[PDB]
Structure 1
């Protein structure tokens, strides 16, 4: 029922009881859950909600969580039944639990844990304790095609049956249609085909309480379960992956975006794991290692997904990987997995336990529903604000600086209606002056400055005029490393211009000032992950609530305003504040470029000279 104001009239379906203050939860019949942080039982309520409910928004006071079938399956896999969950919900809900949600929970939980998929002898078997369900699912035409059949076309005969590897991902989606999702259960201790590996945990590795909780939730009843864990950048996600690999003790596969990710993972493994270097191999296009005796293999998705003809040695390595059975597989940056080529890598690679790690999961193409079965349900997601309070990460000071558009640019901005319009607002002389003043202020404050600009031309022009190093497409790796080392070590240079390649193509050195000038066009998750990766915790300013500085230069009255508003929605859902700054104090006293309007006319001439080709 909907009121005239648009509010959903849930009063009738929610019988309120007199235990208002003690119970902190509101359970609307639509599936949403509201929690008050100031309640004394917030910690218990937070722990209960995280286990069973997927959070939507976590601002300072009231948090909103959502109930999903995948979340219910994850809760069942943890070991919680319907009765205890219902009891805890009723003990915490201010109003009575609607029967619609109750029936929703009853239907999902009963159907969970019925169908099991086993990978043995490089063969996939579907088996269950209820042959009636198996017999019923045989009638499905999609399941008939996915089921492996004999060389003569005859179908193969807790009875299990072989399933085609190429149709595994198809079967995963069909399970949703049949309402019988598969079970990602692995024999953590009962495994015998794959021997253990001489790899342990160094004493220098310390697991933070949330990391330990996430690992223990993943290891349901002592058995590793496939899933996805979301952690903020810089929170030792690589350390968590190394710890999980050491715990598994089986064959380990790790996939990164580029060779830099492979090198970072190898360094972390050497830093925390006890596996010998001879058992660590890099299947990269430049630095190659023999796959013989490769206990842990680190590679990239595109290397395994190279549809074009590969090198002869790479073909041999791929054959060995296909022949080899992998107890554990590790995937980094899950948000790029929904791509079809990278999804095909999952079919190509035969692995028992698959764990995915990333910082964000809100794809702009919303291709995450299928991702819930490509790997599994989201195992854990840490609260950014809570970790900021714990001091594990820097408490970032975020600000959006509005740079007025010059009237000459503004008229041309309105005149242009095609994609060439990006250059006009990305090259605002007023924005240039604001960026120059910010750089001067932070250099006088002795701060590390990273200027991110997606547009190659704008980034190059800004870096050249400001006389700072610039990083763009080619960026020869030797020169890139030299620039990174100069930024890390040389105090004279503390301002680095980085193009779009700064997201995942290489490692971002720890800094404190990050200024974003150019936008992708609405990448609400990509730039958020970039911001998380750029800024890390800095000692000395732990007591202050503003130890990391992020500024977003946005052109007023332009489409960049809408892009920024759409993008910052994800960070606002995390409780991150954003202050709008229209006037910058100190620009009047400081001397900046383009002080005269004729200089801005020259910049306009230069920008117009850069046609739509750039």
Structure 2
């Protein structure tokens, strides 16, 4: 609305500056953005309060940035905070008061809660509201009557239409409450599972659980925790908390195996009580209460096998007290989201290390699952030592002239290969590998295109890993890498970042990436976040290097791809050249070698 002679939005006509603004560490913008002095004496209280009421945008070292959202406001009401309570404390923290536009915005979002609640009973879904009249106006659109099946008033809703109705309810300004009173529920039988005292719960984990379990009723939503932060333990703890039949869904069979191990590792539950409903393996799922499977299995669009149909019908008919969803960034997919309509679950908890995707469907998680129940501050976890200090870097590999000549000439998809394969990027990786290998550092090499992966790994005489590599060959390489001292690096394709349980490594070199996507970048970095046998956070023991070809599309993709990491606070140090690479003996030391590779690169046709 108001803009100065400069592009900055100004709010002098919108809010005043309080008398003790120097003591107050926060500002409230009329557009919903919020800033917080991380160095302020009350930062601790303000951080908790802003994580409770707002959505974090950036959390750098000196000033954090947040924005208000209906979902974040609903979460605030979900922990019992009244409009006056958040307003009074926000005004007290705000050094420039609260703009009336935000105050009235908060009013609407606060009063629009508690009015309508969705609950399921006897495999039937009922929409309840305390006020009886609200239903009459809320039903004024036939989409609800067609969705509706043919005090505390309620009506039953057609299961298949719940997704459409729930999304409408948001833009209809009447969100559905999803608190599940697992404590006062005798209809769904409890399960004999508890967290064994061997399990250790960290403060951030405890915070996320406390925020999810704001009362005796579990709240649905998404918890964002790094893979190294023990997201699996939180999920297992939530199941142990709900004490009712629960369904865990992983994005891969490897994850399903990981979950089984974690459940046995952290809970009193026995192996027979856990089943891994999977096409590749059978555990007689109907024989036990805890089930584990994948979106590909349940979400399967084609004809089901007769045996798998037996379990699925049993799964369909049973009601799940808790539905744990891992790597929910995939959930908004057209097929994966169908799982939410197929399975009947009282409360659904989503977990993921990278709640980002290149499509505008991430926001669906707010209605498909719920608001962000928690989102760890990765810098705080490093400061607390829970995550390894990773000195990220971007090596600006200069492209070779004969490569650039072709790269600039070829505008088709073939340039992705040419910018991925050049002597300088190759020599740089070989040099960094040799250096870290002679430094006795475990190194993981990452790539996308198999052609470059092969030609690099073969020229480096190192074992690569990719899709068609059988599980036996694949794991045998990991065991050698982990244990054999003579091997210290592995060349992994997307298989390593998509979904896997790779052994932790001190160093990671990414020579190729699918694009400027944030998701894959943070998934790759996640592999090195694991704490080592004797490291310390100030040691800067972990490393992460992105190899990019200067003056190429890789530069655009790389900067675009790092957005999520810089938002979390990571410093991508640019490396123009590495001292010693001029004298170290490396491949492509003569133009004929470059020409030979370039010729074969062109032969790719």
The normalised TM-score by structure 2 is 0.98
SS of alignment partner, residue 580 of structure 1: strand
1:167-199 deviation line (CA, Å, top 9, x unaligned): 010011110232101011111210101222111
1:478-535 deviation line (CA, Å, top 9, x unaligned): 1111111111111111110000111233212111111111121211122212212343
1:326-366 deviation line (CA, Å, top 9, x unaligned): 11110000100110100011101111110000012222112
Distance 1:78 1:451 in 2: 44
SS of alignment partner, residue 387 of structure 2: coil
Q: Is the 8 A contact 2:466 2:492 kept in 1?
A: yes
1:261-307 deviation line (CA, Å, top 9, x unaligned): 00000000000001121111111111111122321101000000111
SS of alignment partner, residue 194 of structure 1: coil
Distance 1:146 1:525 in 2: 35
Q: Is the 8 A contact 1:283 1:298 kept in 2?
A: yes
Distance 2:229 2:179 in 1: 28
Distance 1:557 1:124 in 2: 57
Q: Is the 8 A contact 2:181 2:216 kept in 1?
A: no
SS of alignment partner, residue 388 of structure 2: coil
1:108-139 deviation line (CA, Å, top 9, x unaligned): 10011211111110000001111111111222
Q: Is the 8 A contact 2:528 2:542 kept in 1?
A: no
Distance 2:363 2:447 in 1: 31
Q: Is the 8 A contact 2:390 2:542 kept in 1?
A: yes
Q: Is the 8 A contact 1:514 1:535 kept in 2?
A: no
Report the CA distance between 1:368 and its aligned residue.
2.0
Structure 2 residue aligned with 1:206, among 200, 224, 228?
A: 200
Distance 1:425 1:245 in 2: 47
Distance 1:420 1:5 in 2: 43
Q: Is the 8 A contact 2:220 2:369 kept in 1?
A: yes
Distance 1:95 1:570 in 2: 30
Q: Is the 8 A contact 1:257 1:504 kept in 2?
A: no
Distance 2:499 2:84 in 1: 48
Which ranges of structure 2 fall in alignment gaps of 5 or more residues?
none
Report the CA distance between 1:160 and its aligned residue.
1.6
Q: Is the 8 A contact 1:201 1:272 kept in 2?
A: yes
Q: Is the 8 A contact 1:399 1:552 kept in 2?
A: yes
Distance 2:309 2:182 in 1: 31
Which ranges of structure 1 fall in alignment gaps of 5 or more residues?
150-156
**Mean CA deviation greater in 8-17 or 429-438:** 8-17
Distance 1:330 1:399 in 2: 35
Report the CA distance between 1:97 and its aligned residue.
1.0
Q: Is the 8 A contact 1:450 1:496 kept in 2?
A: yes
Distance 1:220 1:81 in 2: 14
Q: Is the 8 A contact 1:508 1:534 kept in 2?
A: no
Distance 1:132 1:194 in 2: 31
Distance 1:543 1:69 in 2: 37
1:298-333 deviation line (CA, Å, top 9, x unaligned): 100000011111211100010110111111110000
Distance 2:240 2:290 in 1: 10
Q: Is the 8 A contact 1:116 1:128 kept in 2?
A: yes
- 1:241-252 equivalent positions in 2, closer than 5 A: 241-252=235-246
Report the CA distance between 1:545 and its aligned residue.
4.5
- 1:53-92 equivalent positions in 2, closer than 5 A: 53-92=54-93
1:400-430 deviation line (CA, Å, top 9, x unaligned): 0011111100010010111111111000111
Distance 1:356 1:96 in 2: 35
**Mean CA deviation greater in 471-480 or 540-549:** 540-549
Report the CA distance between 1:220 and its aligned residue.
1.7
- After superposition, the CA RMSD in angstroms is 1.2
1:203-249 deviation line (CA, Å, top 9, x unaligned): 11011011101101100212111110001121111011111111110
Distance 1:27 1:397 in 2: 34
What residue in structure 2 maps to residue 153 of structure 1? none
What residue in structure 2 maps to residue 277 of structure 1? 271
Matched, 1:304 2:298: yes
Distance 1:127 1:316 in 2: 33
SS of alignment partner, residue 167 of structure 1: helix
**Mean CA deviation greater in 554-563 or 217-226:** 217-226
Distance 2:91 2:160 in 1: 45
Distance 1:373 1:439 in 2: 46
Distance 2:109 2:306 in 1: 49
Distance 1:505 1:89 in 2: 41
Distance 1:259 1:534 in 2: 22
Report the CA distance between 1:460 and its aligned residue.
1.1
Report the CA distance between 1:30 and its aligned residue.
1.1
Distance 2:241 2:10 in 1: 50
Distance 2:75 2:375 in 1: 13
Q: Is the 8 A contact 2:131 2:153 kept in 1?
A: no
1:55-105 deviation line (CA, Å, top 9, x unaligned): 000111010001000000011011110111111111111112111100000
Q: Is the 8 A contact 1:291 1:320 kept in 2?
A: no
Report the CA distance between 1:12 and its aligned residue.
2.0
Report the CA distance between 1:107 and its aligned residue.
0.9
Q: Is the 8 A contact 1:142 1:174 kept in 2?
A: no
Q: Is the 8 A contact 1:331 1:355 kept in 2?
A: yes
Q: Is the 8 A contact 1:229 1:379 kept in 2?
A: yes
1:441-476 deviation line (CA, Å, top 9, x unaligned): 010111111100011111111111111111112110
Distance 2:568 2:359 in 1: 20
**Mean CA deviation greater in 275-284 or 551-560:** 275-284
The normalised TM-score by structure 1 is 0.97
Q: Is the 8 A contact 1:512 1:536 kept in 2?
A: no
SS of alignment partner, residue 275 of structure 2: strand
For this pair of structures, how many residues does the alignment match?
604
Report the CA distance between 1:543 and its aligned residue.
4.8
Distance 2:17 2:326 in 1: 45
SS of alignment partner, residue 363 of structure 2: coil
**Mean CA deviation greater in 500-509 or 172-181:** 500-509
Q: Is the 8 A contact 2:505 2:527 kept in 1?
A: no
Distance 1:159 1:92 in 2: 40
Structure 2 residue aligned with 1:261, among 255, 265, 279?
A: 255
Q: Is the 8 A contact 1:184 1:353 kept in 2?
A: yes
Distance 2:191 2:506 in 1: 40
Structure 2 residue aligned with 1:365, among 359, 368, 376?
A: 359
Q: Is the 8 A contact 2:463 2:490 kept in 1?
A: yes
